[PDB]
Amino acid sequence: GSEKVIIEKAAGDAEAIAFDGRTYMEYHNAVTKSEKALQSNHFELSIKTEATQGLILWSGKGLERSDYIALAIVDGFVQMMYDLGSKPVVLRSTVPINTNHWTHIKAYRVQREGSLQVGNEAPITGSSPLGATQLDTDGALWLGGMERLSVAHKLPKAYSTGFIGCIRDVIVDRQELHLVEDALNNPTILHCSAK
DSSP states (O other): OOOOOOOOOOOOOOOOEEOOSSOOEEEOOOSOTTOOOOSEEEEEEEEEOOSSOEEEEEEOOSOSSOOEEEEEEETTEEEEEEESSSOOEEEEOSSOOOSSSOEEEEEEEETTEEEEEETSOSOEEEEOOSSOSOOOOOOOEEESSOTTGGGSTTOOHHHHSOOOSEEEEEEESSOBOOHHHHHTTSSOOOOOSOO
16 A cells, blocks of 8 residues: 655765865855846855864956955964955954864855954954945955965965865855865865764
8 A cells, every 4th residue: 555655865965075185175156047146145164173274265257357255264263365456355264173173164254344253253444445335246256275375365374275174064154064065176086084
């Protein structure tokens, strides 16, 4: 006869991917092919750092020398540094991240004033000299370093030293979050340790 159709599948939910300092997640995606000109974006993601210096995120796609958004670790702290006109804004974090633990980080970027929070805590903010209140990006994203890290701009080896840790649950404006969907674009993919 028919035993109905039950839905009970729990294979766990810890999409963790370990980096080595060179892995680059090139996530090429667009929020909606039609407008392309948002006014503000949100950035969420957690990470298992294992050092102190290393760039975690970089996005752009829209110009040839403008709108530079990225997220890197320096001295043991993360910092969202972006320049869409001429002055980069490093809203670093005032909390330890090299704790080998899953930390939470975020960033509220509006026109020229951006923000950053380690677990929604003491937010570090900063804004540009309102020299560009209209940037254009396809919500593209690169997280974990950079194949062509000539984007670091002028910071120290932080970008010359990709990140080596684990990252998971990272979304921007409710986009991305498909670690393995665009990560496959890479050659090798790792998960994490201590499990």
